[PDB]
Amino acid sequence: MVILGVGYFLLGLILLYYGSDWFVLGSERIARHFNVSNFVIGATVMAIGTSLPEILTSAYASYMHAPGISIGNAIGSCICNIGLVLGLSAIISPIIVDKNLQKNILVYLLFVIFAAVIGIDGFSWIDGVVLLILFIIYLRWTVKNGSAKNNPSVVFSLVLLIIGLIGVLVGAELFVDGAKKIALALDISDKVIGFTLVAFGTSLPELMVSLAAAKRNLGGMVLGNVIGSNIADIGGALAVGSLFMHLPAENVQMAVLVIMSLLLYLFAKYSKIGRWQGILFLALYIIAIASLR
């Protein structure tokens, strides 16, 4: 059943490509409907929508007594979002960050640092409750200072968003399943090849969404999506995972994330996020995947 593997694989790519653009366009219209910035809609609605892969992966794994998976995938996603995802987007469409989104990015940095320190001895279920509460606070705070019948322009906008989200989520796991069915039918099936495949699959929505937005010069949406997804990975995916079981410490990975997060802030505050910032991010991500576990 080789053909099948390819069928799933390319169909998932079809759903990811077209699904992401619909999701982006639908989110862009919604942002204009609720009079909020593209950053806000990306850091909230879009981020939560694309991080639900991680959240379900994390909870299930830790419940099945594999807490290393929950935290590895959570942190690995964050590193990927800044290194790979934001890296490609910054090059495609350079961003000059307004001084009110710089405040949001600084808050993100503080959140990451707070997570890193309390995770030095691993993440307990109490650590998770705390991170989850901060997650909630971030969302409301991001919405508040980003704000202020049955319209066919609104209905069509929500259809674009939802169908788009379904597209990138179904397509992402058709990608993974399609890849796993090929690797099994070619007898090249490792099980570290399956973990990193599934792990990468959960980051596929963010990748395709942020690339689609970058293609339409929506730099705010991309930046918001990256910041929001990372927070949803830590305050959401990692947090829920800690509820079922103590997540062992990943101090080397956290340090990598803090450094990248710090770089992200300094660039947004005192410079820009363009070509050479993106090249640096991609370099760091490539170094990471070449030397980390």
Ligand X SMILES: CCCCCCCCCCCCCCC
Cα of 140 vs its chain's centroid, Å: 19
Name residues contacting ligand X, limited to 75-134 (CB under 6 A): 107, 110-111, 113-114, 117-118, 120-121, 125, 129, 134
Is 17 one of the binding residues for ligand X (CB under 6 A)?
A: no
Give the residue with the Cβ less far from ligand X, 189 or 271.
271
Q: What are phi and psi of 203, to 5 degrees?
A: -95, -5
Is 20 one of the binding residues for Ca ion (CB under 5 A)?
A: no
- Token reading at 259: 């450094």
SS3 of the chain: helix, strand, coil, percent, to 5: 80, 0, 15
287 binds, among ligand X, Ca ion, none (CB under 5 to 8 A by kind): ligand X
For residues 280 and 262, what is the distance between their CA atoms, to the nearest angstrom? Answer: 13
166 binds, among Ca ion, ligand X, none (CB under 5 to 8 A by kind): none
Q: Which residues pair with 95 in a beta bridge?
A: 273
For residues 67 and 46, what is the distance between their CA atoms, to the nearest angstrom? Answer: 26
Mask 224-263, x = binds ligand X (CB under 6 A)?
-------------------x--------x---x--x---x
| Residue 231 · residue 110 · CB < 8 Å | no
50 binds, among ligand X, Ca ion, none (CB under 5 to 8 A by kind): Ca ion
Residue ranges in contact with ligand X by CB under 6 A: 107, 110-111, 113-114, 117-118, 120-121, 125, 129, 134, 137-141, 143-144, 243, 252, 256, 259, 263, 280, 283-284, 287-288, 291-293
